[PDB]
PDB file of C-alpha atoms and ligand atoms in Angstrom:
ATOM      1  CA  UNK A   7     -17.341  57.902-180.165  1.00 42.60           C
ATOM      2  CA  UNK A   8     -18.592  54.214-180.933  1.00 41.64           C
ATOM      3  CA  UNK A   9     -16.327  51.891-182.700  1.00 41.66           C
ATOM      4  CA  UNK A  10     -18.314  49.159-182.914  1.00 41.76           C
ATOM      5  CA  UNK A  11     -21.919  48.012-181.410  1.00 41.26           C
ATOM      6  CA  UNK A  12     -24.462  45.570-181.585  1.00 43.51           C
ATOM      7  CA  UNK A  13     -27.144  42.942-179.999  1.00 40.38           C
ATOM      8  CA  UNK A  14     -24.934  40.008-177.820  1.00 39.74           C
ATOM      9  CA  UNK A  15     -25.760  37.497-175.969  1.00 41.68           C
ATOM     10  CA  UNK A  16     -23.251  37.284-172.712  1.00 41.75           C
ATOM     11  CA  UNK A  17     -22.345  35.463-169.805  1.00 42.09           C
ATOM     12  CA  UNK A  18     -19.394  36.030-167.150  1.00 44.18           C
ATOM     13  CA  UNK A  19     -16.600  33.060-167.690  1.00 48.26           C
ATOM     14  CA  UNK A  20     -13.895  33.632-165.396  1.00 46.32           C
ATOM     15  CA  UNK A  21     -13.373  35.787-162.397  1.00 46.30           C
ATOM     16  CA  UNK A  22      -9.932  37.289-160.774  1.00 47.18           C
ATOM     17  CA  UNK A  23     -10.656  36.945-156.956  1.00 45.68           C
ATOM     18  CA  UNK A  24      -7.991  37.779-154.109  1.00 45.34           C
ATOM     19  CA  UNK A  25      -4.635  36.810-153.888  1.00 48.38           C
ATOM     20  CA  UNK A  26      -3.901  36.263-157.794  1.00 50.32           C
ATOM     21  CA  UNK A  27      -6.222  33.668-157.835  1.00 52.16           C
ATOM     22  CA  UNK A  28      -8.905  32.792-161.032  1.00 50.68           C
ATOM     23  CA  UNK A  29     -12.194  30.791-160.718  1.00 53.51           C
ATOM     24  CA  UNK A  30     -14.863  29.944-162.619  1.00 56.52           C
ATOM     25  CA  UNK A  31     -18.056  31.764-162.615  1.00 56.84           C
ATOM     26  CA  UNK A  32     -21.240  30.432-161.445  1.00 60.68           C
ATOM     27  CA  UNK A  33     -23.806  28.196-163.446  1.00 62.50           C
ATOM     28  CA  UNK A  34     -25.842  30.690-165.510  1.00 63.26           C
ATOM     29  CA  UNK A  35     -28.225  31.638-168.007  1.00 61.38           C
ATOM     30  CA  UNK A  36     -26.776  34.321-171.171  1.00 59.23           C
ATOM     31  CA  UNK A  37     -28.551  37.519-171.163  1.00 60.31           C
ATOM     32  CA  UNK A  38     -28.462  39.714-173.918  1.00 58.73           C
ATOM     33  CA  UNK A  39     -27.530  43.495-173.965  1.00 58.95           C
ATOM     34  CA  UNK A  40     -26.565  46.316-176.532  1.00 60.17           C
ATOM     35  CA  UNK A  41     -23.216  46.483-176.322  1.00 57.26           C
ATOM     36  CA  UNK A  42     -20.855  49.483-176.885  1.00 58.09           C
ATOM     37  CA  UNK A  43     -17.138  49.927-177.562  1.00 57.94           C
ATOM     38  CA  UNK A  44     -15.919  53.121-176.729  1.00 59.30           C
ATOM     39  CA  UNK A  45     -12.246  53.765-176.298  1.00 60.30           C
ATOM     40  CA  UNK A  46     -11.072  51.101-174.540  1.00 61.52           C
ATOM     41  CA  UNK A  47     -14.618  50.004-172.632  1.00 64.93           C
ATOM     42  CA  UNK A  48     -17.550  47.953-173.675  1.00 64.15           C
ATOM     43  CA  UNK A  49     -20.581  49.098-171.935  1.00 64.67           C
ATOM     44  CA  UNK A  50     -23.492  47.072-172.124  1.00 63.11           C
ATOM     45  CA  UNK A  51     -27.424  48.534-172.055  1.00 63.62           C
ATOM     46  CA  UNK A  52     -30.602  46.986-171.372  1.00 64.45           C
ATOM     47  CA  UNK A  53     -33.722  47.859-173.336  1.00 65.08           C
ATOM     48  CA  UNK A  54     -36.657  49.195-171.960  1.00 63.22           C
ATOM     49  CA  UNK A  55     -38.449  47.285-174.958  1.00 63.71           C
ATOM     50  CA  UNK A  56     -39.916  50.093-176.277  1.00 64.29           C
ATOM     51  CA  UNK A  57     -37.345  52.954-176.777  1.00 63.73           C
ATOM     52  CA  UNK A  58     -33.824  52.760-178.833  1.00 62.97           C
ATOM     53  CA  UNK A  59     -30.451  53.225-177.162  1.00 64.46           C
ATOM     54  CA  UNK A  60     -28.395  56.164-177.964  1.00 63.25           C
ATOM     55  CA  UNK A  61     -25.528  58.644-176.169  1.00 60.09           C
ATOM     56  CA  UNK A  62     -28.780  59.708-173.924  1.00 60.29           C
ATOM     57  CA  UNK A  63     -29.126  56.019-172.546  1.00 61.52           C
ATOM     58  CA  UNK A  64     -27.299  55.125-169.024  1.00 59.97           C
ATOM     59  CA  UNK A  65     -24.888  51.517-169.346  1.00 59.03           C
ATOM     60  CA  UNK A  66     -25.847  48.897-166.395  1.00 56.28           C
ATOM     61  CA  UNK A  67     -22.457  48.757-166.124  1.00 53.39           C
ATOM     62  CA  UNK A  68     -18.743  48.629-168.319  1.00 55.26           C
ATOM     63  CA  UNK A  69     -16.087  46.104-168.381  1.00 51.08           C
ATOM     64  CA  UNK A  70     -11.935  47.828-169.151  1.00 48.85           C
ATOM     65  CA  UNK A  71     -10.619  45.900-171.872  1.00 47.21           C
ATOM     66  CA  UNK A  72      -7.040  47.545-172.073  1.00 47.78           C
ATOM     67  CA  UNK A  73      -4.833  44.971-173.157  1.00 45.62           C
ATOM     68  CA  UNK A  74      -7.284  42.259-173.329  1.00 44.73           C
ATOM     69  CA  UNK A  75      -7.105  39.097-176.011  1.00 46.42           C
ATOM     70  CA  UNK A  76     -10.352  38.004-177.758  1.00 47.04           C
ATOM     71  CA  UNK A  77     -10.818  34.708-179.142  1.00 49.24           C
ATOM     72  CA  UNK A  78     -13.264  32.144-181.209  1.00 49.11           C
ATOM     73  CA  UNK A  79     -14.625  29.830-179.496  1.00 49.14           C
ATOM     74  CA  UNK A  80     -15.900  27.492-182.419  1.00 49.93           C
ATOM     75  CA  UNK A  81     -15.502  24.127-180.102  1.00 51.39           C
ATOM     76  CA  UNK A  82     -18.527  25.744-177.820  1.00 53.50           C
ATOM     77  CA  UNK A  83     -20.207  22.611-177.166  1.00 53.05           C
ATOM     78  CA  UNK A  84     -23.482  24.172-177.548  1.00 49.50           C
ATOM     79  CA  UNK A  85     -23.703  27.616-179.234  1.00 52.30           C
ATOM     80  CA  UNK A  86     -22.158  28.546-182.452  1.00 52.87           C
ATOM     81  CA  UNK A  87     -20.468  31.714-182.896  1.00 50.58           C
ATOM     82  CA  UNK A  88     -19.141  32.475-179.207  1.00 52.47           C
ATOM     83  CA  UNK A  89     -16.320  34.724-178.757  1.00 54.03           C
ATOM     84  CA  UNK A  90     -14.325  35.182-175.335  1.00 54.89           C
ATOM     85  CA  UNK A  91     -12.537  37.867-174.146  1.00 54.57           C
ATOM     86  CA  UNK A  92     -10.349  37.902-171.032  1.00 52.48           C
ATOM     87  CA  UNK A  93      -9.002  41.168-169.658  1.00 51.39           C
ATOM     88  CA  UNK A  94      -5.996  42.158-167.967  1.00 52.56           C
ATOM     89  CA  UNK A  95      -7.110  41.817-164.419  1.00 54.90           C
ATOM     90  CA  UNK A  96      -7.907  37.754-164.906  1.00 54.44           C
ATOM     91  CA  UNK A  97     -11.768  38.069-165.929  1.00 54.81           C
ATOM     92  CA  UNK A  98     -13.177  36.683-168.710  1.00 57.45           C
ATOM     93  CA  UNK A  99     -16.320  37.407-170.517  1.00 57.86           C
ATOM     94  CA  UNK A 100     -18.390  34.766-173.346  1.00 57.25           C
ATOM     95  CA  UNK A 101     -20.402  36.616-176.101  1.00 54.19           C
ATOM     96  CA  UNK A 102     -22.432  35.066-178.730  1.00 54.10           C
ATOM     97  CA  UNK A 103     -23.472  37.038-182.169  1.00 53.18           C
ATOM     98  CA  UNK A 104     -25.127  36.059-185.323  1.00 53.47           C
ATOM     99  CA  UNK A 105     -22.749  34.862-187.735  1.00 50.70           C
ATOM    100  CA  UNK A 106     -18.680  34.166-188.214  1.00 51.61           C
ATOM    101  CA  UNK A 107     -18.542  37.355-190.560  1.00 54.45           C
ATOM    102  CA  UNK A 108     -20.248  39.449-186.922  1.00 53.91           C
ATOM    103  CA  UNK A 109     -17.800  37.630-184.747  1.00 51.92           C
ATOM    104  CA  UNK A 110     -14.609  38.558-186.683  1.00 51.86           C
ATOM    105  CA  UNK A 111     -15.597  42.364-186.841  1.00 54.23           C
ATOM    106  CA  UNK A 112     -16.332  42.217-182.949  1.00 52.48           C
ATOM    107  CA  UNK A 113     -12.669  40.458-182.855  1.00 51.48           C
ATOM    108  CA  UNK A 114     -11.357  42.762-184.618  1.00 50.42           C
ATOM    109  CA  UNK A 115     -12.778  46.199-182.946  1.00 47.79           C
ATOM    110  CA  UNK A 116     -11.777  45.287-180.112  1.00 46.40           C
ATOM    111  CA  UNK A 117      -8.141  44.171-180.569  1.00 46.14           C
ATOM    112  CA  UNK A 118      -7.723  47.867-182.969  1.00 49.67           C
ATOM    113  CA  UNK A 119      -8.862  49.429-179.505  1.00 51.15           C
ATOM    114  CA  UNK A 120      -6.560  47.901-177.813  1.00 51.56           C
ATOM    115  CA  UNK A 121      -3.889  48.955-180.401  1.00 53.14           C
ATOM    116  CA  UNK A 122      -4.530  52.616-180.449  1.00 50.93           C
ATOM    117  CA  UNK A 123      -4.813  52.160-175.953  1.00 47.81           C
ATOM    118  CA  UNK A 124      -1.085  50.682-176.604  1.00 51.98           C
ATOM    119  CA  UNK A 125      -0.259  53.266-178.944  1.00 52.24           C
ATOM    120  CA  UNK A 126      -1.578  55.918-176.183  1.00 51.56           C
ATOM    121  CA  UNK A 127       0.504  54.791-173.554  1.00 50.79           C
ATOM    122  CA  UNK A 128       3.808  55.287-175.366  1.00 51.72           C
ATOM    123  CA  UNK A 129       3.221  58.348-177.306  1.00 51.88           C
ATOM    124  CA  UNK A 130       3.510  56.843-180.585  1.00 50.82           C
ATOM    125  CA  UNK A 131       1.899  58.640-184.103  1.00 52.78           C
ATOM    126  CA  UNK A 132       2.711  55.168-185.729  1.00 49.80           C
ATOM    127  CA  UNK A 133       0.802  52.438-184.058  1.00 46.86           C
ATOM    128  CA  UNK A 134       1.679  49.293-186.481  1.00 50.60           C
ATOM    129  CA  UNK A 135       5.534  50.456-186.242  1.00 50.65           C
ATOM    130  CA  UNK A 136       4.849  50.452-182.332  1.00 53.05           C
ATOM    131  CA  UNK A 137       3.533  47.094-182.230  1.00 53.50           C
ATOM    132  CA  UNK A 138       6.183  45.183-184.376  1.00 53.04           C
ATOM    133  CA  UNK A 139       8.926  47.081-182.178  1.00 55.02           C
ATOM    134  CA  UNK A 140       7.287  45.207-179.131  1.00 56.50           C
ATOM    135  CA  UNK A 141       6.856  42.282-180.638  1.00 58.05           C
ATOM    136  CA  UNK A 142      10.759  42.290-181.248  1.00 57.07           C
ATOM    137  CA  UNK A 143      11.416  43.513-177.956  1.00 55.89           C
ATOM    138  CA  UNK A 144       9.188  40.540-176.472  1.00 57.50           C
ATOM    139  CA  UNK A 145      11.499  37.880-178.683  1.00 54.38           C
ATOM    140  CA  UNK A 146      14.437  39.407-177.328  1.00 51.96           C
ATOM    141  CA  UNK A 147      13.203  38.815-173.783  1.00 49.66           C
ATOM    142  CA  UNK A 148      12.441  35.482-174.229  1.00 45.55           C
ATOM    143  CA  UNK A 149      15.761  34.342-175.987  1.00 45.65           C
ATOM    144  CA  UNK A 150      17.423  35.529-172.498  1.00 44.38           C
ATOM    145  CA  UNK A 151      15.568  34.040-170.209  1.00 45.17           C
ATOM    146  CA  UNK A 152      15.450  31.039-172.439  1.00 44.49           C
ATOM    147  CA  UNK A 153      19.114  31.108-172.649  1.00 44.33           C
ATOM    148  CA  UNK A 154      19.619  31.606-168.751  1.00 43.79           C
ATOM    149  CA  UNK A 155      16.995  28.864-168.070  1.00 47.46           C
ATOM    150  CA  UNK A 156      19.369  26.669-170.114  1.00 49.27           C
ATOM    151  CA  UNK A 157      22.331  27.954-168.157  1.00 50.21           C
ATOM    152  CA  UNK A 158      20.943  27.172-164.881  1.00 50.58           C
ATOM    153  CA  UNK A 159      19.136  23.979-165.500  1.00 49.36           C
ATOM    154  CA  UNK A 160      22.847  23.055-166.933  1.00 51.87           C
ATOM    155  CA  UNK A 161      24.342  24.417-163.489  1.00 52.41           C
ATOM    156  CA  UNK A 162      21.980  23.078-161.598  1.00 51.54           C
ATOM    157  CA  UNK A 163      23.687  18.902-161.120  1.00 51.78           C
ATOM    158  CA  UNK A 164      27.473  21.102-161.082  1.00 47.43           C
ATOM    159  CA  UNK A 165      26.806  23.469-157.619  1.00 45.39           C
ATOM    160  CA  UNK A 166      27.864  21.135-154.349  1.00 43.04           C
ATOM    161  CA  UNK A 167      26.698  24.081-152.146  1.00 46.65           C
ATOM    162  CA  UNK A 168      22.968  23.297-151.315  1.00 49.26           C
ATOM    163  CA  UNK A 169      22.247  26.552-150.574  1.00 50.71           C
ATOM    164  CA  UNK A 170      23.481  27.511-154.164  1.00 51.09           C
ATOM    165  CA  UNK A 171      21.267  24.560-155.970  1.00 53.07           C
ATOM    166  CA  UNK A 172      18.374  25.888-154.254  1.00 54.76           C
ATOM    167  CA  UNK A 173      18.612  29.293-155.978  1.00 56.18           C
ATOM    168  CA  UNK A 174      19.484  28.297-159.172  1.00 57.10           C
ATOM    169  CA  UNK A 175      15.926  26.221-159.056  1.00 57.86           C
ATOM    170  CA  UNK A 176      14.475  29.202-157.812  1.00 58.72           C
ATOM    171  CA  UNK A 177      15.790  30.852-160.750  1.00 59.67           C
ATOM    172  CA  UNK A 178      14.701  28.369-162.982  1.00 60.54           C
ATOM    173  CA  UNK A 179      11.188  28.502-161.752  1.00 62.27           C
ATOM    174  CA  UNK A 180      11.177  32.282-162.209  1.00 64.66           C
ATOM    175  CA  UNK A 181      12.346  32.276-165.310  1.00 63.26           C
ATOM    176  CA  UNK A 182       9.661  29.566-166.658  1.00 61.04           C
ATOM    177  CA  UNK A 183       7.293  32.135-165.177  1.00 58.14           C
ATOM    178  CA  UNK A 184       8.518  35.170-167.016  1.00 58.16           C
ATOM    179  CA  UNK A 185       8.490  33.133-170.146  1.00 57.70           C
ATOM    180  CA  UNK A 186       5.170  32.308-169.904  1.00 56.42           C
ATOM    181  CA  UNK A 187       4.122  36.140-169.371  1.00 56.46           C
ATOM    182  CA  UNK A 188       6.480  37.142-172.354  1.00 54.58           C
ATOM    183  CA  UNK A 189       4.442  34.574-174.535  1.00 55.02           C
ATOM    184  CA  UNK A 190       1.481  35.732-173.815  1.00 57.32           C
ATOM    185  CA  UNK A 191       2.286  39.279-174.179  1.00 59.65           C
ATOM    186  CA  UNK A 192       3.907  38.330-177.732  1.00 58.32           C
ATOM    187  CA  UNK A 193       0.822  36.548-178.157  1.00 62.97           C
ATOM    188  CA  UNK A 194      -1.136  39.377-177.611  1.00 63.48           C
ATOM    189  CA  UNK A 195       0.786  41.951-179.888  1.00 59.48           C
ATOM    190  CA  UNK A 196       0.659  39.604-182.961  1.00 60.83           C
ATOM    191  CA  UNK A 197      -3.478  39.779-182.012  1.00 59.68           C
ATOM    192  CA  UNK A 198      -3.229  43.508-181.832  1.00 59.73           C
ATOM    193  CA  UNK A 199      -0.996  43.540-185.112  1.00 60.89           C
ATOM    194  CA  UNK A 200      -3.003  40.806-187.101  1.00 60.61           C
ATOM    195  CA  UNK A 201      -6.269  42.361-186.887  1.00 63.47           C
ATOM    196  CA  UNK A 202      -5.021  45.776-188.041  1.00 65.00           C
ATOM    197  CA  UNK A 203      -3.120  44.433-190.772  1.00 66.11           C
ATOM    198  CA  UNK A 204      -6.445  42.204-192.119  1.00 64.49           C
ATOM    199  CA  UNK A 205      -3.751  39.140-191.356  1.00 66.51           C
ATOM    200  CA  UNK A 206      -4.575  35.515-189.779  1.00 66.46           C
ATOM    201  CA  UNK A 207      -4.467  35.592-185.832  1.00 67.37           C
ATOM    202  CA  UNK A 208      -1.537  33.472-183.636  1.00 65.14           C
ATOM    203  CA  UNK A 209      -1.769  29.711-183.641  1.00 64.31           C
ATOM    204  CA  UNK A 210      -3.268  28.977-180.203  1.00 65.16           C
ATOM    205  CA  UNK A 211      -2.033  25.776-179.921  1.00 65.22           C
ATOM    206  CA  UNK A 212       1.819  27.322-179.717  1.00 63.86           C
ATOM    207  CA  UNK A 213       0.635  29.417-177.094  1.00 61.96           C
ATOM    208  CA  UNK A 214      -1.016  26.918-174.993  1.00 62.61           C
ATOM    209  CA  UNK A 215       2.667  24.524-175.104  1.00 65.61           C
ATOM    210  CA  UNK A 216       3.616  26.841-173.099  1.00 62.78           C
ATOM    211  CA  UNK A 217       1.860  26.399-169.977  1.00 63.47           C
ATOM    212  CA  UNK A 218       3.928  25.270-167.108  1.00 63.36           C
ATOM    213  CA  UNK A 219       3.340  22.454-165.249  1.00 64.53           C
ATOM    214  CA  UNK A 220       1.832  24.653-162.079  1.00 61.36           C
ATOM    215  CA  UNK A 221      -0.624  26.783-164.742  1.00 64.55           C
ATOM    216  CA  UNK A 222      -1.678  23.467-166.463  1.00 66.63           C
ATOM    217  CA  UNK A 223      -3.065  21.886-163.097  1.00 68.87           C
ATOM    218  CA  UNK A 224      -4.423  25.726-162.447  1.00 70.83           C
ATOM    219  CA  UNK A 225      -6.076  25.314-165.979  1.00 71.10           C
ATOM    220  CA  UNK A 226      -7.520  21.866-164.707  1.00 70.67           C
ATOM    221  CA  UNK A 227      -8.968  23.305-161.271  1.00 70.71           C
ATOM    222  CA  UNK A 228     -11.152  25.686-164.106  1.00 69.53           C
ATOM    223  CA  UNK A 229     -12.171  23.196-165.877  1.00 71.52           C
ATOM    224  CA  UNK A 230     -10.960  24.800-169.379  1.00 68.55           C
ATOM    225  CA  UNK A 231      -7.254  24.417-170.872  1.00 69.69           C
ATOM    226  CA  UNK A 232      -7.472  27.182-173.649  1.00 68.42           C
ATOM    227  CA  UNK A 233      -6.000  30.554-174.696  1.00 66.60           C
ATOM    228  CA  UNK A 234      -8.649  32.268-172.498  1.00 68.09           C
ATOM    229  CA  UNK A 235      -8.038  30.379-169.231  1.00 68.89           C
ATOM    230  CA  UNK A 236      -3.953  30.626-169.550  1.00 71.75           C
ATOM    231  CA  UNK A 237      -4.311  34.286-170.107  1.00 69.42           C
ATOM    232  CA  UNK A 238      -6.491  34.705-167.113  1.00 66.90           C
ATOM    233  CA  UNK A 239      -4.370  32.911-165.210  1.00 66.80           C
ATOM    234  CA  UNK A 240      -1.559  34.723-166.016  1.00 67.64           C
ATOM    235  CA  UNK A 241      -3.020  38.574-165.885  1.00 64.00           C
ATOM    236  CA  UNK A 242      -4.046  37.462-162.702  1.00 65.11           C
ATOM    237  CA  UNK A 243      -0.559  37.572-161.594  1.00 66.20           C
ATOM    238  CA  UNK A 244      -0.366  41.385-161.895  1.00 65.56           C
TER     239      UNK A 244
HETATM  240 CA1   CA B 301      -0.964  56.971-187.146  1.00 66.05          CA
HETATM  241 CA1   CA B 302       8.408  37.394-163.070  1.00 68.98          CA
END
């Protein structure tokens, strides 16, 4: 049914275009629409200013959010209580509500559906037990690659063959890339986890250290180094 709805103000942020790429949205005004999460979409309905909106009323039109991270965005430079969520295609989305009490609830229906959409996906009863057994599998992931990074970065002044140095950088480079999907994804789990278990969210600062070089000057291009922007830029890869 409805999870969660209510009155926001919103404005398109970011937006995936071809070839992996992420750009900013045009200059534009907010508008404001009821907006509706069911399952694992938010639809969002205009008024006709005179009736309400109810199961009867048709959406203008529905954004996925499947595996999508929401976060405050207290350093607006102009509105107070803005929110931003960025999906898993590379899109991001701005919403303003009424009070920090309003945008914590909206943070936190959204990140449970994308909890019980995880929970679908592997057949699990337990959802909490599901998330904190990806989370561990994430850390796992990342302690190899880190490891192998280390390795090859190590290797890399020890190969004479030139052929050979050139695909241990190669390596290197993936590897910084798959570490900087597994941190996001980790990231993302301890959002899905935190808001279930009433808990404090992830530091983003931690996150955003790990930006590579390449996804910082992507970042830059935007116009916006934050959570939002690196995960953008990064589901944008998929
Ligand atoms: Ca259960
Ligand atoms: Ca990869």
């Amino acid at each position: 049914t409805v999870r969660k709805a209510g009155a926001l103000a919103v404005k398109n942020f970011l937006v995936h275009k071809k070839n992996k790429k992420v750009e900013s949205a045009t200059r534009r005004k907010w508008k404001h629409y009821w907006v509706s999460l069911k399952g694992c979409t938010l639809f969002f309905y205009e008024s006709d200013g005179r009736s309400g909106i109810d199961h009867n009323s048709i959406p203008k039109h529905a954004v996925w959010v499947e595996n999508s991270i929401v976060q405050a965005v207290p350093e607006h430079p102009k509105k107070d209580f803005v929110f931003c969520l960025s999906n898993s295609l590379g899109d991001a989305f701005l919403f303003q509500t009424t009070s920090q009490t309003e945008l914590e609830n909206w943070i936190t229906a959204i990140h449970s559906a994308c909890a019980t959409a995880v929970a679908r996906h592997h057949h699990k009863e337990d959802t909490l037990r599901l998330l904190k057994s990806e989370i561990k599998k994430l850390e796992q992931k990342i302690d190899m690659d880190e490891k192998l990074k280390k390795m090859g970065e190590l290797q890399l002044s020890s190969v004479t063959d030139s052929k050979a140095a050139a695909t241990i950088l190669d390596q290197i480079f993936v590897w910084e890339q798959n570490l900087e999907q597994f941190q996001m994804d980790l990231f993302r789990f301890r959002c899905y986890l935190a808001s279930l278990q009433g808990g404090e969210l992830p530091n983003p600062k931690r996150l955003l250290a790990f930006a590579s070089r390449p996804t910082k000057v992507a970042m830059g291009r935007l116009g916006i180094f934050s959570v939002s922007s690196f995960h953008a830029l990064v589901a944008a890869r998929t």
